[PDB]
Design a binder for this molecule. Structure first.
Ligand code: Y07
Ligand code: Y07
Ligand code: CL
Ligand code: CL
Ligand code: CL
Ligand code: CL
Ligand code: MG
Ligand code: MG
Ligand code: MG
Ligand code: MG
Ligand code: MG
Ligand code: MG
Ligand code: MG
Ligand code: MG
Ligand code: MG
Ligand code: MG
Lengths: 228, 228
């Protein structure tokens, strides 16, 4: 549907939609931009991530409300409506995963792009895992793990320990361990090592970089406080 | 699209969607319920109102953000995107107005239903007026006025001055005077007379009715403080 709109116009409208808090529109504009086939800049990758994080975040919040009501109930209506929301959420995750697979990850050669997109791949498989059951659940969990692991391997080789993309990936992979993989020890170990290694590298940063890094370190700290 | 779902199931799902903050779904469920052709109870009228108030409220907020950006700008992109949001907002108002006209108002014989639906008709024409220009704007403004006026005439004859539906109608009609009709004196006069007449009738109310009435009186007071 965005085929006829200029790439630059799609990006401008994504930024307008963000200002207007119209995240579904923002996601559709950014999907349109990705579908132009050109690589995305740092700023554009962030718009893509913000758009979809907000759309799926609304769906996750609703799915949690409905799943809780359903669990307390256990007519077909609560299950039906939870399934409707679930299917829409799965559709959004599949769309994002589709964009990463066609062809963002394949064309991403710099560490900052490649780690960003692999982290996104991990996150959206993780959101699929949250609603999955049984064996289905196992292959989705391993897809999330695999994407996070490749992202981590590159991040550790190519980025300093205070790099915000590296920090956010480790944060999210630790949440995956705690919430999805039933590995709270791995979660705590990862968050603590990441935090400690970032602390030791802060002395190399400017005021503004220090601010960006320490903000994410505080999230690692918040989790560690929740988990210990 | 809701033709195949039971009326009772649509109402149950509207309530679930409200809990999940899924207002677009809530509105679609309630549109489905209205389209069953049966009158709506007090509780169901409130679900219909809440659903659409939230959907149009999001669109109004976005339209205001974009209109402000557009005014500061004065490429085609801001205007295009403001028009897109505007058209969607107009679509929602036209849908609500359509439900009231087919056939909620015509079948509504009790004061509490008839005033409720005429107030809604005033409100949705008012939202259309907010984005309208020129002469177009004049016929829409008079449609809002006419609906509010019929609602007021019934409310004054049939309801006590503390009735929350009567109070909310007067509040909204005063906002129409202030914001749409360029009649701030009429706005202030209406809010003040409504407030004073409700005050004098509070002595007749139970604790819970007193709470409901005084909450809306506080909104009239808030406006009077804003306007004077
Ligand atoms: O509240 C959270 C917290 O979850 C995290 C904490 C630390 C790292 C990663 C996550 P997330 O599970 O990727 O969102 N997530 C969340 C966010 C939204 C929002 F804000 F994007 F709309 C909505 C729903 C949820 Cl669960
Ligand atoms: O903030 C307001 C205040 O406007 C009023 C104040 C007193 C009476 C009636 C109105 P309204 O213009 O019918 O919403 N309206 C508004 C509400 C939403 C919400 F909360 F429904 F999402 C969104 C946008 C607006 Cl402008
Ligand atoms: Cl459903
Ligand atoms: Cl490459
Ligand atoms: Cl547009
Ligand atoms: Cl009648
Ligand atoms: Mg071009
Ligand atoms: Mg039931
Ligand atoms: Mg399912
Ligand atoms: Mg490097
Ligand atoms: Mg231990
Ligand atoms: Mg039936
Ligand atoms: Mg331009
Ligand atoms: Mg227009
Ligand atoms: Mg009466
Ligand atoms: Mg005067």
């Amino acid at each position: 549907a965005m085929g006829s709109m200029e790439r630059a116009s799609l990006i401008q409208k994504a930024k307008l939609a963000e200002q207007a808090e119209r995240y579904e529109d923002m996601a559709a504009f950014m999907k349109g931009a990705v579908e132009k086939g050109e690589e995305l800049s740092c700023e554009e990758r962030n718009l893509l991530s913000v758009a979809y994080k907000n759309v799926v975040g609304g769906q996750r919040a609703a799915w949690r409300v409905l799943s809780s009501i359903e669990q307390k109930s256990n007519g077909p209506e609560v299950r039906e409506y939870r399934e409707k929301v679930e299917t829409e959420l799965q559709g959004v995750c599949d769309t994002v995963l589709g964009l990463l697979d066609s062809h963002l990850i394949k064309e991403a050669g710099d560490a900052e792009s490649r780690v960003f997109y692999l982290k996104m791949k991990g996150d959206y498989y993780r959101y699929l895992a949250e609603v999955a059951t049984g064996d289905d659940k196992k292959r989705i969990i391993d897809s999330a793990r695999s994407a996070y692991q490749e992202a981590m391997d590159i991040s550790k080789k190519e980025m300093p320990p205070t790099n915000p993309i590296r920090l956010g990936l480790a944060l999210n992979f630790s949440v995956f361990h705690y919430e999805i993989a039933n590995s709270p020890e791995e979660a705590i170990s990862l968050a603590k090592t990441t935090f400690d290694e970032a602390m030791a590298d802060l002395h190399t940063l400017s005021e503004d970089s220090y601010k960006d890094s320490t903000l994410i370190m505080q999230l690692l700290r918040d989790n560690l406080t929740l988990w210990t």
